[PDB]
């Protein structure tokens, strides 16, 4: 125990004196022999030596561990990948020092360098290899996070829409996971629209439509109302016409799922604002309202044709909403008779 | 002839599904006795690995030392380069 | 029948099981050369849409019941149209695509 | 997600089917332009298996 | 002509067609004919392959013209009527149908015809079809691209799959509201109507249903196809709904079997295991399944008419074993992902859990040893678990190591005294004749006389059956002992570990074995030791000891594939049984050798106990691997007219096993 730090520095001497016998392996032991060499050596797995070391502080001093990987620089392994990006790649997952070891992106989207930036020229491949060993740990925000600042634009977008997609319909409650991404996303989309970024076109539209789907959830709990329908006649998610419904009834298909989950809460919020709008005509009595009273009978009837095209286009989607989505969106129009 | 009529309406249903659960007994024993012995030959190839890396009996003793664990009362915080491990580490950053 | 209601005689014969190919067949070509006459006044890309429309719809419904959907002769149908008509080459395969 | 591994297969077999029918065919420049289209689609399954 | 006549009859329904009684009658008598012409074919002069296939192929037409109608009750009773000859003569000829192509379409064309019909009237049609179906595609291996139109079959077998087991569901609801029906035992008349139809038939539509569903399913290699199907219908919900009740009920046995012979099948692939678990699996059968092995405490009557039916026949102990089966497949394939609900599972079915793994000692039965394996292959699954079923089991967990134990106790002692093993099997397989008092003593003799006759012999074929059944018994106990040492291995920390690491903790490790060397008794308290693992290793080197004397060339007989197969399986399983057997033995002794209790005497008598009989081990073992085992190395030597090279030699020779290196290894730090 009180010996290690003596024989990793001895290991660092004999290393790049090139004394060192090295095991041409990662799983091997942290001696070995060999089927070619002399039968009175043996080889160190240098790597292994130093992946037992650096792992007493891989945690709390990683700034350091950097330095030891270092020597591991001009080293790989059978498949040919380098040992400091792997090594690295492993020290910044449960490290978590993102911003200090592999830089930040600053407001403007100007990337702000790490420690990292000492070793390499260029710090994309390793970007983008921690992006990557972060989605297959589910850290997506982070992995989002790292995928701008190593600009591959793209993949940011395939992150943010998977998680705003179970998110959109949320209450924008302070500090939520809602407030959160949604904040993360405009943040994202300002850069890009200021930078000039835009991506695999499938992607980069369900990002926007994600978005202005918030501003529709947002708008409709602070009981705006006729704003959230001021924005989904934009939106073109649902028909409105009759003469529209096969127009969406098609371009359902081309949607993706991010939208696709989303569309009954959509087709609930819109219902509850054309049976909102419904209760307010009903409300506003003729005692008062100085109109011809064609302009009321006019609006009884639209937001009929508008409830019923919404049950029509619900009727005519080939995904699962739920029964209690049809039965709530067949409700509503029952009590907007 | 009208019970044999019967009978052999009874043979074309009935032995079929005898053939057909013959298939899953078949086919879930025998995949899970061959996974059994597939699992087996990894545990003689890691003892090949293992021994012909330490060869004939000329490595072992990991050293005599306390264990640790998940459990039991550390205080003094977290940061674990010692004085000599940080001197050292010092001239590392001193060298790269 | 006396008013020759083609998308009303699919439905009828679906509701009652009852599928003869020959008259299936024969009730998609009464639906497909009707859309493709009573459009005759619009150009190609709105004919095409059209009978896209035509098709996607009436291809939600019986495309979960094969035998009052025959695919093969629908494409086979259309293409000849294509051919004839000198529509795109990607129409048939957006059209099922789309379905 | 399963399937596209069994169906590349049964692309590249059909589009080298196709460009043996193409091949016996009198060469006129619509021939040759599919003998293109076909071989530019090959030479993308080559890369989606 | 009675294909003909069966066309023209559905060309001509909607006129008045005056003579379909003759007709009718004509079609009747040609099935007739045709049955008597498969069974009697040597009589019929009915020989030719080719007039079957189209005596077969028109009556396959002959049917599809029929069925085609739905409108027609003529039809449909013609057709229902075609349709039972179409499938004797399938079953009958079903390796001269060299052919599965024309077959499957008319069969798709046919279920969709009868799929088009009076649900009460084709019922007797739909299962037909489906036994059909099933035939077809036990005939020949096929993929998703040699079945027409795969994914509508699919849907259409799953649809009329949830018209059956909703109505299987209430009928057994209905049965559960109308309280005490009486045992009215007898009524000996013939073949009337309305007596109410049971669903749960082996010929019937819910049941032939899963069955198809299955060998459907045994095509479809990713799961991709099937999976399409049942997100368009919740048929994993219905289906355990249904199950659930029955289990509950002990009632629709052929269904409950069908079930967890499908959802077995499913839990193969990743897709299907991840689907059956996201069904609620464990909870329609976990507190369901309790019912099936509780015993009334009402006692009465034990009923002895358990005569010679098939171990393939549906039963409650075999819905046991299925849902064991089930279980081990589950945890298998989803691992943590299956976890919990393996611990909620073997928490609740810990009695039987123990009663199984020590039926073993008490009723060596085939069916027993059926069930043990499976008990031990679930263990085996969940024991890589050990510190997450030591948390939330740490009784139940102590208590399948010691009963483990004891089942390798037993098992190897009976597979050690193969006498003591027939005769278990010969005290029950005769029966019939009490008596009692004791005593004693003196003595004959002699003599007459006299005659005649006649004349039997004593049949070989006995002495040929006992020993086949021998034979499957100590393969049985073979693969229960093989499950066991590795299950046991697991409580046991690894060899690598207890030799090499010196702060290695002693405590979360029990000993398994006692520290005796005496070979095992079968005896009912002796706990297991080294002198019951010495005996395992010279059990399974004396078994491979007679799989190489079985080697004269008898020639002349021809049919059977499997026994090659079977004499490869068989020396893989003694191997593992040996090696897992090595691996407890060292851990074990190395778990006594370093212990501060264990007393200075007894760890030097283990030191020279285990020294010598290890010794004397790997001298057979070095006197058997000289010969080769079954290898790509020993395959490399083999050759002598051709393949050698340098002088003599072919390949290399002398890669040794690590088993034979490992146990040197350990008989060599003995020695010090």
Redesign the interface.
């Given at each position: 125990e009180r010996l290690r730090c003596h024989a990793v520095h001895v290991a660092l001497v004999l290393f790049e004196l090139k004394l060192l016998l090295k095991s041409s392996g990662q799983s091997a032991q942290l001696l070995s022999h060999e089927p070619g060499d002399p039968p009175c050596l043996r080889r160190l797995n240098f790597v292994r030596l130093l992946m037992l070391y650096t792992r007493k502080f891989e945690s709390t001093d990683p700034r350091e561990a950097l330095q030891y990987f270092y020597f591991l620089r001009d080293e790989k392994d059978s498949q040919g990948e380098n040992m400091f990006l792997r090594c690295v790649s492993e020290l910044v997952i449960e490290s978590r020092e993102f911003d200090m070891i592999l830089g930040k992106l600053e407001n403007d989207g100007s990337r702000k360098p790490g420690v990292i930036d000492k070793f390499t020229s260029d710090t994309k491949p390793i970007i983008n290899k921690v992006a990557s060993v972060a989605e297959n740990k589910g850290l997506f925000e982070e992995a989002a996070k790292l995928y701008d600042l190593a600009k591959n634009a793209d993949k940011v977008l395939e992150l943010m829409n998977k998680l705003l997609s179970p998110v959109v319909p949320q209450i924008s409650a302070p500090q939520s996971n809602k407030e959160r991404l949604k904040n993360m996303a405009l943040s994202i989309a300002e850069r890009y629209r200021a930078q000039g970024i835009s991506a695999n076109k499938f992607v980069d539209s369900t990002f926007y439509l994600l978005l202005d789907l918030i501003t529709f959830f947002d708008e409709y709990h602070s009981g705006h109302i006729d704003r959230a329908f001021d924005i989904i006649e934009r939106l073109k998610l649902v028909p409105l016409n009759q003469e529209s419904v096969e127009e969406r009834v098609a371009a359902f298909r081309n949607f993706s799922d991010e939208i696709r989950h989303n569309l009954s809460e959509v087709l609930l919020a819109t219902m509850n604002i054309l049976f909102t709008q419904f209760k307010r005509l009903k409300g506003t009595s003729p005692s008062s309202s100085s109109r011809p009273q064609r302009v009321i009978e006019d609006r009884d009837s639209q937001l009929r044709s508008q409830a019923r095209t919404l049950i029509t286009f619900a009727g005519m989607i080939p995904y699962r909403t739920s029964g209690d989505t049809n039965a709530r969106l067949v409700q509503m129009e029952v009590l907007m008779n | 002839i009208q019970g044999f009529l019967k009978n052999e309406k009874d043979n074309a249903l009935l032995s079929a599904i005898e053939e057909s659960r013959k298939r899953t007994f078949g086919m879930a024993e025998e995949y899970h006795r061959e996974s059994m012995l597939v699992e087996w030959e990894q545990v003689k190839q890691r003892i090949l690995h293992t021994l012909l890396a330490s060869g004939e009996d000329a490595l072992d003793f990991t050293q005599e030392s306390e264990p640790s664990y998940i459990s039991d009362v550390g205080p003094p915080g977290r940061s674990s380069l010692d004085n000599i491990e940080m001197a050292y580490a010092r001239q590392i950053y001193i060298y790269n | 029948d006396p008013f020759k209601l083609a998308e009303c005689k699919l439905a009828i014969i679906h509701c009652a099981?009852?599928?003869d190919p020959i008259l299936v067949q024969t009730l998609w070509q009464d639906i497909i050369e009707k859309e493709l006459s009573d459009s005759v006044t619009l150009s190609s890309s709105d004919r095409m849409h059209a009978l896209?429309?035509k098709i996607?719809?009436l291809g939600?419904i019986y495309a979960g019941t094969?035998?009052f959907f025959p695919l093969d002769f629908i494409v086979q149908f259309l293409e000849q149209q294509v051919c004839t008509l000198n529509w795109d080459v990607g129409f048939v395969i957006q059209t099922m695509?789309?379905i | 997600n399963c399937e596209r591994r069994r169906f590349t297969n049964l692309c590249l077999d059909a589009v080298c089917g196709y460009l043996v029918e193409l091949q016996s065919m009198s060469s006129s420049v619509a021939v040759q332009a599919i003998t293109g289209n076909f071989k530019s689609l090959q030479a993308k399954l080559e890369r989606l298996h | 002509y009675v294909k003909s006549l069966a066309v023209h009859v559905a060309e001509t329904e909607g006129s008045s067609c005056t003579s379909l009684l003759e007709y009718q009658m004509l079609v009747s008598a040609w099935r007739m004919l045709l049955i008597i012409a498969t069974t009697h074919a040597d009589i019929m002069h009915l020989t030719d392959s080719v007039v079957r296939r189209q005596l077969f192929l028109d009556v396959l037409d002959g049917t599809k013209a029929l069925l085609l109608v739905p409108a027609s009750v003529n039809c449909l009773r013609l057709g229902s009527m075609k349709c039972t000859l179409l499938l004797i003569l399938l079953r009958q000829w079903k390796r001269e149908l060299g052919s599965v192509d024309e077959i499957l379409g008319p069969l798709t064309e046919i279920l969709e015809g009868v799929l088009q019909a009076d649900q009460q009237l084709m019922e007797k049609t739909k299962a037909k079809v489906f036994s059909a179906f099933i035939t077809v595609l036990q005939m020949k291996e096929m993929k998703v691209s040699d079945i027409p139109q795969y994914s509508q079959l699919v849907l259409n077998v799953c649809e009329t799959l949830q018209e059956e087991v909703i109505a299987l569901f209430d009928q057994t609801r209905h049965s559960l509201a109308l309280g005490s029906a009486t045992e009215d035992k007898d009524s000996m008349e013939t073949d009337d109507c309305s007596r109410s139809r049971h669903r749960d038939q082996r010929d019937g539509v819910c049941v032939l249903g899963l069955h198809l569903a299955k060998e459907l399913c045994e095509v479809d290699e990713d799961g991709d196809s099937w999976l399409q199907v049942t997100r368009r219908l919740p048929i994993l919900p219905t289906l355990l709904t249904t199950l659930e009740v029955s289990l509950r009920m002990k009632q629709n046995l052929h269904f409950t079997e069908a079930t967890l012979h499908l959802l077995l099948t499913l839990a193969r692939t990743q897709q299907g295991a991840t689907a059956v678990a996201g069904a609620g699996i464990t909870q329609s059968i976990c507190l369901p399944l309790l019912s099936v092995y509780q015993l009334s405490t009402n006692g009465t009557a034990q009923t002895p008419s358990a005569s010679r039916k098939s171990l393939d026949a549906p039963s409650w102990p075999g819905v046991y074993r299925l849902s064991m089966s089930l279980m081990e497949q589950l945890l298998k394939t989803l691992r943590y992902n299956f976890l919990p609900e393996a611990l909620d599972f073997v928490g609740v079915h810990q009695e039987r859990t123990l009663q199984c793994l020590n039926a073993v000692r008490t009723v060596q039965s085939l069916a027993c040893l059926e069930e043990a394996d499976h008990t031990v292959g679930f263990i085996l699954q969940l024991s890589n678990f050990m510190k997450e079923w030591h948390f939330h089991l740490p009784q139940l967990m102590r208590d399948i190591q010691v009963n483990l134990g004891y089942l390798c106790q037993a098992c190897t002692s009976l597979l050690h005294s193969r006498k003591m093993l027939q005769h278990y099997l010969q005290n029950k397989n005769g029966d019939g004749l009490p008596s009692a008092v004791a005593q004693r003593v003196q003595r004959p003799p002699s003599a007459a006389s006299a005659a005649p006759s006649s004349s039997k012999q004593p049949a070989a074929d006995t002495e040929a059956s006992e020993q086949q059944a021998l034979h499957t018994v100590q393969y049985g106990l073979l693969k229960i002992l093989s499950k066991t040492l590795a299950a046991l291995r697991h409580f046991t920390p690894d060899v690598c570990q207890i030799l090499l690491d010196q702060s290695l903790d002693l405590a979360e490790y029990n000993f398994l074995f006692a520290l005796s060397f005496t070979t095992p008794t079968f005896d009912s308290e002796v706990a297991p030791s080294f002198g019951t693992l010495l005996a395992t290793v010279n059990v399974a080197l004396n078994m491979l000891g007679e799989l190489d004397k079985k080697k004269e060339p008898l020639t002349q007989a021809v049919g059977l594939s499997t026994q090659a197969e079977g004499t490869r399986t068989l020396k893989s399983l003694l191997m593992f049984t040996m090696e897992n057997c090595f691996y407890l033995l060292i851990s074990q002794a190395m778990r006594y050798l370093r212990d501060p209790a264990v007393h200075p005497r007894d760890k030097q008598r283990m030191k020279q106990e285990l020294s010598s009989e290890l010794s004397t081990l790997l001298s057979s073992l070095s006197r058997y691997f000289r010969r080769g085992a079954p290898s790509s190395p020993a395959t490399g030597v083999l050759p002598s007219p051709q393949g050698k090279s340098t002088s003599l030699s072919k390949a290399s020779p002398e890669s040794q096993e690590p088993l034979i290196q490992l146990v040197q290894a350990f008989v060599r730090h003995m020695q010090r």
């Amino acid at each position: 125990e009180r010996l290690r730090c003596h024989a990793v520095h001895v290991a660092l001497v004999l290393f790049e004196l090139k004394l060192l016998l090295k095991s041409s392996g990662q799983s091997a032991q942290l001696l070995s022999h060999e089927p070619g060499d002399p039968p009175c050596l043996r080889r160190l797995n240098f790597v292994r030596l130093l992946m037992l070391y650096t792992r007493k502080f891989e945690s709390t001093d990683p700034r350091e561990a950097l330095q030891y990987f270092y020597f591991l620089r001009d080293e790989k392994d059978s498949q040919g990948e380098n040992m400091f990006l792997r090594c690295v790649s492993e020290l910044v997952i449960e490290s978590r020092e993102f911003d200090m070891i592999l830089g930040k992106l600053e407001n403007d989207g100007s990337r702000k360098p790490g420690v990292i930036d000492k070793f390499t020229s260029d710090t994309k491949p390793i970007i983008n290899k921690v992006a990557s060993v972060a989605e297959n740990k589910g850290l997506f925000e982070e992995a989002a996070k790292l995928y701008d600042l190593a600009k591959n634009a793209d993949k940011v977008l395939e992150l943010m829409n998977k998680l705003l997609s179970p998110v959109v319909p949320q209450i924008s409650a302070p500090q939520s996971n809602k407030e959160r991404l949604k904040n993360m996303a405009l943040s994202i989309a300002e850069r890009y629209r200021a930078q000039g970024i835009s991506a695999n076109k499938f992607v980069d539209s369900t990002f926007y439509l994600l978005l202005d789907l918030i501003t529709f959830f947002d708008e409709y709990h602070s009981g705006h109302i006729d704003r959230a329908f001021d924005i989904i006649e934009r939106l073109k998610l649902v028909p409105l016409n009759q003469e529209s419904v096969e127009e969406r009834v098609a371009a359902f298909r081309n949607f993706s799922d991010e939208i696709r989950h989303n569309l009954s809460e959509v087709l609930l919020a819109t219902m509850n604002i054309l049976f909102t709008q419904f209760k307010r005509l009903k409300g506003t009595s003729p005692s008062s309202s100085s109109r011809p009273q064609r302009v009321i009978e006019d609006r009884d009837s639209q937001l009929r044709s508008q409830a019923r095209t919404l049950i029509t286009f619900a009727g005519m989607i080939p995904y699962r909403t739920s029964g209690d989505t049809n039965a709530r969106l067949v409700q509503m129009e029952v009590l907007m008779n | 002839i009208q019970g044999f009529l019967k009978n052999e309406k009874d043979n074309a249903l009935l032995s079929a599904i005898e053939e057909s659960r013959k298939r899953t007994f078949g086919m879930a024993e025998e995949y899970h006795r061959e996974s059994m012995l597939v699992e087996w030959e990894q545990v003689k190839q890691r003892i090949l690995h293992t021994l012909l890396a330490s060869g004939e009996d000329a490595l072992d003793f990991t050293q005599e030392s306390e264990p640790s664990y998940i459990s039991d009362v550390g205080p003094p915080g977290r940061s674990s380069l010692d004085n000599i491990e940080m001197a050292y580490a010092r001239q590392i950053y001193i060298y790269n | 029948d006396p008013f020759k209601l083609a998308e009303c005689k699919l439905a009828i014969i679906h509701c009652a099981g009852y599928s003869d190919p020959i008259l299936v067949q024969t009730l998609w070509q009464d639906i497909i050369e009707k859309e493709l006459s009573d459009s005759v006044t619009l150009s190609s890309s709105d004919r095409m849409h059209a009978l896209s429309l035509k098709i996607v719809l009436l291809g939600k419904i019986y495309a979960g019941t094969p035998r009052f959907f025959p695919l093969d002769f629908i494409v086979q149908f259309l293409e000849q149209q294509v051919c004839t008509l000198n529509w795109d080459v990607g129409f048939v395969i957006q059209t099922m695509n789309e379905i | 997600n399963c399937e596209r591994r069994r169906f590349t297969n049964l692309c590249l077999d059909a589009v080298c089917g196709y460009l043996v029918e193409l091949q016996s065919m009198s060469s006129s420049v619509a021939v040759q332009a599919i003998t293109g289209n076909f071989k530019s689609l090959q030479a993308k399954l080559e890369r989606l298996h | 002509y009675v294909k003909s006549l069966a066309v023209h009859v559905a060309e001509t329904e909607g006129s008045s067609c005056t003579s379909l009684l003759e007709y009718q009658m004509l079609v009747s008598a040609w099935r007739m004919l045709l049955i008597i012409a498969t069974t009697h074919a040597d009589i019929m002069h009915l020989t030719d392959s080719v007039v079957r296939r189209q005596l077969f192929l028109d009556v396959l037409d002959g049917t599809k013209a029929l069925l085609l109608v739905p409108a027609s009750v003529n039809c449909l009773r013609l057709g229902s009527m075609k349709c039972t000859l179409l499938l004797i003569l399938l079953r009958q000829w079903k390796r001269e149908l060299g052919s599965v192509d024309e077959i499957l379409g008319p069969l798709t064309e046919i279920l969709e015809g009868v799929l088009q019909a009076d649900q009460q009237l084709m019922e007797k049609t739909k299962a037909k079809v489906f036994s059909a179906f099933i035939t077809v595609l036990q005939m020949k291996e096929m993929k998703v691209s040699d079945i027409p139109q795969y994914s509508q079959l699919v849907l259409n077998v799953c649809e009329t799959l949830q018209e059956e087991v909703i109505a299987l569901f209430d009928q057994t609801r209905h049965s559960l509201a109308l309280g005490s029906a009486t045992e009215d035992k007898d009524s000996m008349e013939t073949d009337d109507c309305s007596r109410s139809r049971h669903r749960d038939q082996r010929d019937g539509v819910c049941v032939l249903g899963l069955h198809l569903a299955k060998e459907l399913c045994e095509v479809d290699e990713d799961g991709d196809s099937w999976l399409q199907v049942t997100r368009r219908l919740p048929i994993l919900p219905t289906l355990l709904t249904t199950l659930e009740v029955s289990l509950r009920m002990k009632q629709n046995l052929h269904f409950t079997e069908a079930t967890l012979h499908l959802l077995l099948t499913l839990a193969r692939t990743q897709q299907g295991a991840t689907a059956v678990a996201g069904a609620g699996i464990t909870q329609s059968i976990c507190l369901p399944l309790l019912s099936v092995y509780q015993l009334s405490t009402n006692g009465t009557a034990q009923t002895p008419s358990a005569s010679r039916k098939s171990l393939d026949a549906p039963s409650w102990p075999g819905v046991y074993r299925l849902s064991m089966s089930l279980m081990e497949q589950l945890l298998k394939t989803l691992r943590y992902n299956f976890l919990p609900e393996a611990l909620d599972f073997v928490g609740v079915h810990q009695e039987r859990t123990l009663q199984c793994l020590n039926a073993v000692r008490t009723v060596q039965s085939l069916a027993c040893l059926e069930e043990a394996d499976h008990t031990v292959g679930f263990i085996l699954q969940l024991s890589n678990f050990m510190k997450e079923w030591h948390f939330h089991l740490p009784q139940l967990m102590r208590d399948i190591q010691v009963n483990l134990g004891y089942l390798c106790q037993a098992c190897t002692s009976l597979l050690h005294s193969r006498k003591m093993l027939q005769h278990y099997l010969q005290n029950k397989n005769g029966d019939g004749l009490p008596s009692a008092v004791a005593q004693r003593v003196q003595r004959p003799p002699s003599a007459a006389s006299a005659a005649p006759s006649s004349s039997k012999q004593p049949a070989a074929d006995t002495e040929a059956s006992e020993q086949q059944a021998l034979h499957t018994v100590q393969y049985g106990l073979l693969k229960i002992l093989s499950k066991t040492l590795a299950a046991l291995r697991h409580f046991t920390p690894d060899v690598c570990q207890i030799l090499l690491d010196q702060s290695l903790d002693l405590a979360e490790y029990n000993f398994l074995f006692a520290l005796s060397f005496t070979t095992p008794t079968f005896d009912s308290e002796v706990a297991p030791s080294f002198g019951t693992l010495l005996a395992t290793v010279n059990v399974a080197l004396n078994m491979l000891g007679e799989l190489d004397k079985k080697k004269e060339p008898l020639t002349q007989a021809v049919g059977l594939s499997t026994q090659a197969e079977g004499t490869r399986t068989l020396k893989s399983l003694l191997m593992f049984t040996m090696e897992n057997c090595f691996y407890l033995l060292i851990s074990q002794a190395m778990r006594y050798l370093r212990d501060p209790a264990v007393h200075p005497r007894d760890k030097q008598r283990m030191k020279q106990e285990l020294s010598s009989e290890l010794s004397t081990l790997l001298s057979s073992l070095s006197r058997y691997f000289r010969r080769g085992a079954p290898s790509s190395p020993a395959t490399g030597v083999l050759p002598s007219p051709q393949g050698k090279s340098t002088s003599l030699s072919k390949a290399s020779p002398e890669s040794q096993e690590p088993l034979i290196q490992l146990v040197q290894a350990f008989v060599r730090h003995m020695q010090r």
